[PDB]
């Protein structure tokens, strides 16, 4: 199978991982100096947030130059050294390709805003790189994504005297994919990095490329067409590289981003649909929403693999759940107003779960056991918290906590000189939560996570198996099998905070002998009608093999 | 009904708990400021280590004055205010009555060593307070308790020109209980504290009062007779006060220390027999030793209550297990030979259990679920570590860790000026393990402990019920009922580190449903032959009641 199917991904922000030069900003030399940590954790692929020059109004997702390294992060040479060192350790690396929009500081937009013709009457070739309007009335009733900042998807530019489209901040003007030149520019950006040996891209905001009058301006066939263009380019010119889509949409919309066997699109898509139902099922002590949303996911192509995740650098998005699920989620996971942003919840995993290690482990087990390749958000493996005093979504992007020394080991500069301040509170601060402590503590979360990955790695059915949900007679207990190449796994998870009984329907496995993956402790052989009783402790996870 | 049967005890050392004035030494005004913490935790009775003037060669168990407060700890006025403040909050307080021996700095012994006659020719009345010998040849083949330090139970006093007896350090000369004045002096010392309102005593080293030639000089009938005299004195003069015995002896010798209905002795005795079997069963993944040692304990009198404990200010003693068991325990729990002392292991609870919170909870639940009144060792409720850099047993006696401030909040004195240095290592240090963190952390060990005590408190069967072991079909799974006043609890505990299947013998409860004590979730009703299948995750504890 393709490499990305067997990978474990790790998401990090270079500016926030390791400062290698004392200026309070993370950088590539710093990242390079920490690759053994990632190697030894059990990670195979690093996904780096945007590393491009940018005034950072959306933390680098406002790109000013696609073919450069932001000066905070070092130089292109540093980037090539990093990539060489990552590759030498068996780490693949993917970048973040921001296709839908650029910074307003990008030279193209600086050019475009002069208007349709240059001062001397000549056509301004860059004007058409962006999406302009006389009165900002096209595409009405299309949704606003950054609901807490933007009141419209059109903003008046003072210099051009016309409106320009933007699905995100006003400082992120949308690119005009009806202009063939724009398409070519982004194929070119992609080539630049793939020519350096980058293993692929996470592609940002894929559903919003094309706008059409009388549509939602999301998931349009025309957008898919373009994305297939990217795939074909990579298949012809860079065989084996990964395209991974950020498509935060309903199940049936998301699965379209894989394309077809005849017309391939992405290799991978994040499982956005399952992610909120994990947190919901935990609070409701009822896992039906997980089965229901997985059941709405169509079959994907041969080459396709889901990318499973718990959290990421953004808020926990609630955009694609119902109004009642959303309200439930806010009540359960955002009791203070400042915890919410833009139709979502800007908190880290450990805080979301009351720092309850039994729950954190539970959800990580499900992360690793569902069909796909999992992605860890940096620092969740040590139980980092958040800083909701920081604006926007920056409170989940505080510096990695390496040790208890100056600024959590992130930098030799003092905390208050760090790009974002390293967490110091009594619960989650680097005094208490840091890699070094957890390397010495035999029972740490760091250790637990590396061990759980090693356990996953010893059973390829987690990465490659099919999935079948098993009836349990108790909504609190989730059970499924993963089968691949002669091994059947049975995964049984209790989402309730107290002990629970179930009656598993193991009819198809009469005469099979369940044993724990860890140590092969035997459970009773399945007999009779195969209705198999279980009890589980609070937040328990049973990882089993059904010997044939 | 008697208060001590319903109490949760907490063992602490005043010198090591809270320093109020900043000299590096814990004191009474300091302890007084922390009474709300102990109350809120769910503690009812404080047992304080010896608070008496002493040169501290055995950390205060070498008493130089039975009727004062050691200057380190404040004044007798401080003690009274402390006692008033504890009672004001509905706490009980017991002290540590050191009956077997005094410090060699005690004036009695300073007098005694001058010999039978004073310089004025008069007889020396203090000489017979201690146990003298011309050649130290009596009582040979008595066990030496401090095996790592002492070569003999006799030591030649150079002034007296004679040998004196000591079961502990040579600086702890044994008192002569065949002298009736000695008995009266210790009745008087007891009176002194009981008249101030002290609620009782923990009585130190009770098996060793009387020596007799041709015996082991432990547990002799004459020693029990003396102890019965303390009980009579208390029952007549101070009804309701507690006498708790430290007798580290085999089951049938320990039970002797309760006395009988007709001839009462101690109200409570520490359950030394079960303590080492908890740890051994965890590492063996086999609980049969717990059932065997509990089964070997005779019924105790009506007024009697066991005091159950996991650890204390001493080493985990292995003196009263078999050679095979001892070798097993050393291998499992003393990987470094420095961790051994006096036929036991000088480590704290959390380190012993590899800081595994799942195991720490399991053993704590077992401690709370077995018959008796539990005693918690200060700092175990936050997961304190140990410091083997300190001599003797002092490595488990480091200052309590309140916050991440100056010396873990124990003192404004620097760590190196504290009586014992606060732990500062990366795993257990005060930056990582402290009260204030755990008060803010919704899922801390501290909160967990408070909540589990609350749960225990809501079910009087734990404090007062009978006990009946239940067949499980799996030695890893321990199961028992506790029955009292119309309620039957069912407590099931997995001592293995992976999932285990069981088949519980619940034939006596066909037609009843087990339900969780926590959150009232019912489990399937018992039916048919009452053989009840369970599965348990690693180190799970199921606290259930059996409904009608
Ligand atoms: Ca667009
Ligand atoms: Ca004696
Ligand atoms: Mg830097
Ligand atoms: Mg002091």
Numbering used by the authors:
A (entry chain A), B (entry chain D): 6 to 553
From the paper:
Trehalose synthase (TS) catalyzes the reversible conversion of the inexpensive maltose into trehalose in the absence of any coenzyme. DrTS consists of a catalytic (β/α)8 barrel, subdomain B, a C-terminal β domain and two TS-unique subdomains (S7 and S8). Domain C and sub­domain S8 contribute to dimer formation, while subdomains B and S7 serve as a gateway for the opening and closing of the active site. In the present study, we have determined crystal structures of the wild type and the N253A mutant of TS from Deinococcus radiodurans (DrTS) that reveal a closed conformation for intramolecular isomerization.
